Amino acid sequence: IPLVNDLRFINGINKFIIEDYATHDFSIGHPLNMPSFIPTATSPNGCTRIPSFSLGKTHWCYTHNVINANCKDHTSSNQYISMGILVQTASGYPMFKTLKIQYLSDGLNRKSCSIATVPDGCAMYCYVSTQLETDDYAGSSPPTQKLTLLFYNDTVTERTISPTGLEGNWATLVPGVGSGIYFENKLIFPAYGGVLPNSTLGVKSAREFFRPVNPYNPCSGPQQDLDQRALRSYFPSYFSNRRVQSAFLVCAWNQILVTNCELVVPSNNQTLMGAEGRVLLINNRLLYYQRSTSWWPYELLYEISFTFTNSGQSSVNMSWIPIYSFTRPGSGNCSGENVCPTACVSGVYLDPWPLTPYSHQSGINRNFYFTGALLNSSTTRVNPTLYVSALNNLKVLAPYGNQGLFASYTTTTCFQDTGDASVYCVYIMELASNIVGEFQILPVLTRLTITG
């Protein structure tokens, strides 16, 4: 059995589904039933969390974390990894057929793992956690960074890596949880951590800040005061006042067995405080989702491009897509109602799937649409809701479950059946279950109907 999706999906993956630059109305279909490819816990109080999912052209890759005790405890953890294909069922829609499983269970607490689809298998970037995250940021040396390659021929290889730029500049670095991407002989993962303010990187970027403004809901104050507050928001005392920074782990695939990879650090003039994220490749255009862990509560998606120069002088440029639609839940001064620059470590991972390009060869598409699963609360991780969103407003909403259902991380991927033109979106959501532990991670497949 080849590691190849059904042919009707191969040319409908990682494509912009709506290329009209025109206005559209949307209807989200009912969940389509199949045997879930994501295993639940087998105990009422075991922790199962942190999904990472990538649908590649020929196969998909998936991973999440399993703890025998509650989520907050951190002695031991295990990492479930699987790869598989899309297969059409007689019910009229595809199912995710698992072809290989790896359960990393060796006493190493691999955490925040991000998965990527690579030729003949999967690649996974983790860090080994031995202490509290706050202890990581208070420290002076990053935790162990691991790169795991899992192939269809049942070969599994794992290496400790020390990417160029890490040592001397960072207190800590972890993967971005959201999936990475394989693109032009490069393996690219999202990452984030704490930069030592007095280091080389810290000094160069000391004055960098980005302050998005919702013109419909502006923050009160003079420009200079708001800018100073936005700059200070990058150094939360919760993380020992390090500069919390997003970054990209970039590895040369042709040297994947020996390279140490390299950290490509964006300018903080173009991005908010470091956080979880996801790297997408759609129509050969790279995008970066950034979790709204900082004060800005709206959905963060950037158009990004890399400049690769021979000797570790790689750079990345990012261009914020101006989105003002819905807010993510947060605590205290960092709820979905706050739009003012303050020191925030809050929010929740809720990534989007863009249905349309934003920047194209002809210009900029104001009729931008994206879809995903949100949490309908300004303060609480509750009420999972499927949505399609425009730049400024929501187009359609479809709750999952009853009001009051607790839920957390969500990651969404859409693809098209080029046989019958069906548009499918899978909404992978951490959902609170009455019988298994914190979060049955449920992959909800729906058909998306698009009209004028």
Ligand X SMILES: CC(=O)N[C@H]1[C@H](O[C@@H]2[C@H](O[C@]3(C(=O)O)C[C@H](O)[C@@H](NC(C)=O)[C@H]([C@H](O)[C@H](O)CO)O3)[C@@H](O)[C@H](O[C@H]3[C@H](O)[C@@H](O)[C@H](O)O[C@@H]3CO)O[C@@H]2CO)O[C@H](CO)[C@@H](O)[C@@H]1O
Ligand Y SMILES: *[C@@H]1O[C@H](CO)[C@@H](O[C@@H]2O[C@H](CO)[C@@H](O)[C@H](O)[C@H]2NC(C)=O)[C@H](O)[C@H]1NC(C)=O
Q: Note whether 138 binds ligand NAG by CB under 6 A.
A: no
Which residues ranging from 393 to 412 are in contact with a second copy (CB under 8 A)?
400-401, 405
Q: How far apart are CA 195 and CA 140, in angstroms?
A: 10
For the CB of residue 196, give the shortest distance to a second copy in the complex, in Å.
34
Phi, psi (degrees; rounded to nearest 5) at 252:
-75, 115
Q: Where are the beta strands (DSSP E) in 176-211?
A: 181-183, 186-195
**Residues 362-374: b if buried by 16+ CB within 10 A, e if exposed:** eeebeebbbbbbb
Q: Which of 61, 71, 123, 124 binds ligand X (CB under 6 A)?
A: 71
* Rounded Cα gap, residues 37 and 39, in angstroms: 6
Maximum C-alpha span of the chain: 63
* Minimum CB distance to ligand X, residue 35 (Å): 18
Q: Give the footprint of ligand Y on this chain (CB under 6 A).
A: 120, 151, 153, 155, 256-257, 270, 317, 319
Strands, sheet with 47-55, edge to edge from the N-terminal-most edge strand: 47-55, 60-67, 78-88, 94-104
Residue span 85-124 as binding mask against a second copy, x where in contact by CB under 8 A, dash where not: --x-xxx---x-xxx-x-x-xxx-----------------
Among 196, 226, 252, 397, binds ligand NAG (CB under 6 A): 397
Tell me the three state secondary structure of residue 33. Answer: coil
Asked whether 240 and 200 are in contact (CB, 8 A), the reply is no
Q: Pick from 23, 43, 185, 269: which binds ligand NAG (CB under 6 A)?
A: 269
Instruction: Name the percent of the chain in helix, strand, coil, to the closest 5.
Output: 10, 45, 50
Q: Which residues contact 120 (CB under 8 A, 6 or more apart)?
A: 3, 151, 152, 153
| Residue 207 interface partner, choices a second copy, ligand X, ligand Y, none, CB cut-off 5-8 Å depending on type | none
3-state secondary structure of 343: coil
Q: Is 326 in the site for ligand NAG (CB under 6 A)?
A: yes
Q: How far is the CB of 218 from ligand X (least distance, A)?
A: 25
Q: Kindly indicate which of the ranges 116-124, 215-223, 411-419, 442-450 contains the residues binding a second copy, using the contact rule CB under 8 A.
A: 442-450
The secondary structure element, H or E, covering residue 154 is none
Report d(CA 13, CA 414) in Å as an integer. Answer: 8
Task: Decide if residue 188 touches a second copy (CB under 8 A).
Answer: no
* E-strand stretches of 105-168: 110-118, 121-128, 145-151, 156-161
Find, among 95, 103, 110, 85, the residue nearest to 39 by Cα.
103
- Binds 90, which of a second copy, ligand NAG, ligand X, none (CB < 5 to 8 A, cut-off by type)? a second copy
64 lies in the site for ligand X, by CB under 6 A:
no
Q: At 129, list the tokens.
A: 């956690």
User: Which of 15, 16, 46, 164 is close enough to bind a second copy by CB under 8 A?
Assistant: 46
Q: Which of 4, 11, 20, 42 binds a second copy (CB under 8 A)?
A: 42
User: 193 near 246, Cβ under 8 Å?
Assistant: no
Q: Does 262 bind ligand X (CB under 6 A)?
A: no
CA 72: distance to chain centroid? 21
- Angle, vertex CA 225, rays to CA 171 and CA 229, nearest 5: 25
256 touches, from ligand X, a second copy, ligand Y, none (C-beta below 5 to 8 Å by class): ligand Y
Contact between 207 and ligand NAG per CB under 6 A: yes
Question: Among ligand X, ligand NAG, a second copy, none, what binds residue 35 when CB lies within 5 to 8 Å by partner kind?
Answer: a second copy
Selection from 264, 358, 280 nearest residue 320 by Cα = 358
- Which helix (H) or strand (E) segment holds residue 5: the answer is none
- Regarding 233 and contact with ligand NAG (CB under 6 A), the answer is no
Measured CA to CA, the distance from residue 55 to residue 49 in angstroms comes to: 19
Q: Is 1 in the site for a second copy (CB under 8 A)?
A: yes
Q: Indicate which of ligand Y, ligand X, ligand NAG, none lies near residue 174 (CB less than 5 to 8 Å, by partner kind).
A: ligand X
Beta carbon of residue 5, minimum distance to ligand NAG (angstroms, whole number): 32
For residue 293, the minimal CB distance to ligand X (Å) is 5
Q: Is 103 in the site for ligand X (CB under 6 A)?
A: no
If one asks whether residue 238 binds ligand X (CB under 6 A), the answer comes out as yes
Binding site for a second copy (CB under 8 A): 1, 30-37, 39-44, 46-48, 66-68, 76, 78, 80, 87, 89-91, 95, 97-99, 101, 103, 105-107, 154, 400-401, 405, 431-437, 440, 442-445
Binding site for ligand NAG (CB under 6 A): 207-208, 267, 269, 326, 376, 385, 394, 397
